[PDB]
Design a binder for this molecule. Structure first.
Ligand SMILES: COc1ccc(-c2ccccc2C(=O)Nc2cnn(C)c2)cn1
Lengths: 39, 156
């Protein structure tokens, strides 16, 4: 049985940790809502 | 029940201890998460009950108490922030430039940040603090890391 707890406000924060790349990927979306790589 | 706007943890006691299965966004009295986190089950907030209102396994979204409210979109240029809420760890903003999921039905923003499965439902923000989508549905890549769509619903 699932419950929710508040974890914070939704705010943009100036000077957060800036990380991650920006990959361009060919993907398929099936009827179950699973993405997959089309190569 | 607590109906204040903000980000929330989704928890179960059906396993060992209290386990975090995902995250969601309360806005305008509606709770928003990803389908794979709740499987469309009802939710408790204190003594209050949240019943599902709208959902779609293919979009992998679900709303509680009311229709989908989040209509903001990635502009396809500007950096964004993943307001990650990992299991047992404080809310933390992580700023990134999204890549692109190319599909037959069109292009979608993607964020390449690696967090436990229980972080599914964490919101992605634009510069004005508006939710442009939820983190937690995408693909495992050549490397082995995770890339998530920026998944957004339609507002009617
Ligand atoms: C199999 O290895 C893993 C481990 C973890 C993840 C993962 C990582 C970040 C955010 C969400 C997820 C996640 O679980 N998404 C998802 C979508 N649909 N279902 C059923 C689960 C994906 N793959």
């Amino acid at each position: 049985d699932m419950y929710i707890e508040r974890a914070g406000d939704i705010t943009w924060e100036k000077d957060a940790e800036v990380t991650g790349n920006s990959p361009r990927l060919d993907v398929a979306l099936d009827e179950s809502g699973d993405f997959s790589l089309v190569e | 029940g607590e109906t204040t706007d903000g980000v929330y943890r989704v928890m179960t006691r059906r396993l060992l201890g209290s386990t975090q299965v995902g995250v969601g966004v309360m806005q305008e009295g509606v709770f928003h998460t990803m389908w794979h986190v709740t499987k469309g089950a009802a939710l408790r907030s204190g003594e209050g009950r949240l019943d599902p209102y709208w959902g779609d396994v293919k979009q992998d979204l679900v709303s509680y108490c009311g229709p989908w409210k989040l209509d903001a979109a990635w502009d396809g240029l500007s950096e964004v922030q993943l307001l990650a809420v990992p299991p047992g760890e404080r809310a933390k903003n992580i700023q990134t430039l999204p890549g692109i999921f190319k599909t037959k039905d069109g292009d979608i923003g993607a964020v390449a940040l690696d967090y436990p499965a229980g972080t599914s439902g964490s919101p992605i923000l634009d510069k004005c603090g508006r939710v442009i989508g939820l983190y937690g549905n995408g693909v495992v890549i050549k490397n082995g890391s995770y890339v998530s769509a920026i998944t957004q619903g339609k507002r009617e």
